[PDB]
Enzyme design. Structure first.
Site, PDB file in Angstrom:
ATOM      1  N   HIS A  41      13.422  38.128  51.331  1.00  9.24           N
ATOM      2  CA  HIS A  41      14.600  37.279  50.971  1.00  9.24           C
ATOM      3  C   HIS A  41      14.217  36.007  50.182  1.00  9.24           C
ATOM      4  CE1 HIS A  41      14.017  35.540  55.171  1.00  9.24           C
ATOM      5  NE2 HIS A  41      14.289  34.412  54.510  1.00  9.24           N
ATOM      6  N   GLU A  72      11.016  43.691  55.223  1.00  6.76           N
ATOM      7  CA  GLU A  72      11.263  42.233  54.995  1.00  6.76           C
ATOM      8  C   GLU A  72       9.963  41.490  54.657  1.00  6.76           C
ATOM      9  OE1 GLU A  72      14.158  41.332  54.356  1.00  6.76           O
ATOM     10  OE2 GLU A  72      13.763  39.172  54.045  1.00  6.76           O
ATOM     11  N   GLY A 146      14.417  26.626  57.551  1.00  6.11           N
ATOM     12  CA  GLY A 146      13.145  25.950  57.211  1.00  6.11           C
ATOM     13  C   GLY A 146      11.912  26.663  57.787  1.00  6.11           C
ATOM     14  N   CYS A 148      11.388  30.066  57.962  1.00  4.93           N
ATOM     15  CA  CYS A 148      11.087  31.408  57.389  1.00  4.93           C
ATOM     16  C   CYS A 148       9.713  31.391  56.697  1.00  4.93           C
ATOM     17  CB  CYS A 148      12.219  31.926  56.502  1.00  4.93           C
ATOM     18  SG  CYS A 148      13.663  32.400  57.498  1.00  4.93           S
TER      19      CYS A 148
END
Length: 182
Positions: A41, A72, A146, A148
């Site tokens: 992402h 991911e 914040g 990730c």
């Protein structure tokens, strides 16, 4: 404060960089040579900022399992003049549950942050922001925006990167030794 924080700090001080994309600043774990990981992402493009240095991206690959399901994790190769310490030997070979983990973050916003998140469950399937996702780890800590890309460690192992949460629980994508073979 303790052996968990000691291992976490050892990884953060040599194997992280601050990655900036159009989607924000992320903790980015360097694994070996010029090869790093970041949550998919982040939307890595042709150019990325690394510790505020404009950097060409030589390759980027958004990983999926053999069921063709999102993991991911994006593996990035950076046009950087310096190699990472090789930490592949700290990566688990199999999916597993874990005791006593630390989530470590380093951004402009949250420098030198270490969270004792406790027991880590092999959760497996998660619908993550509407995307079916496999190989998810879960911990009962209220993680926030914040965090990730934050690195999930036990004493001795680098097990995952933080990819999201629901306000009560946080979720990490597994790191496996097989993702980074030569």
């Amino acid at each position: 404060m303790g052996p968990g924080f000691d291992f976490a700090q050892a990884i953060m001080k040599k194997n992280t960089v601050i990655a900036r994309t159009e989607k924000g600043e992320f903790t980015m774990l360097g694994v070996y040579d010029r090869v790093a990981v970041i949550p998919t992402h982040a939307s890595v493009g042709e150019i990325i900022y690394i510790n505020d240095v404009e950097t060409r991206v030589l390759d980027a690959c958004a990983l999926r399992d053999l069921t063709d399901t999102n993991l991911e994790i994006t593996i990035v190769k950076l046009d950087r003049n310096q190699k990472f310490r090789d930490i592949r030997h700290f990566l688990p070979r199999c999916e597993d549950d874990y005791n006593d983990a630390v989530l470590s973050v380093h951004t402009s916003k949250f420098p030198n942050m270490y969270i004792p998140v406790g027991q880590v469950t092999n959760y497996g399937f998660l619908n993550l922001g509407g995307t079916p996702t496999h190989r998810i780890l879960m911990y009962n800590f209220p993680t926030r925006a914040g965090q990730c890309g934050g690195v999930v460690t036990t004493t001795g192992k680098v097990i995952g990167i933080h990819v999201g949460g629901n306000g009560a629980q946080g979720f990490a994508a597994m790191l496996l030794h097989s993702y980074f073979t030569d």
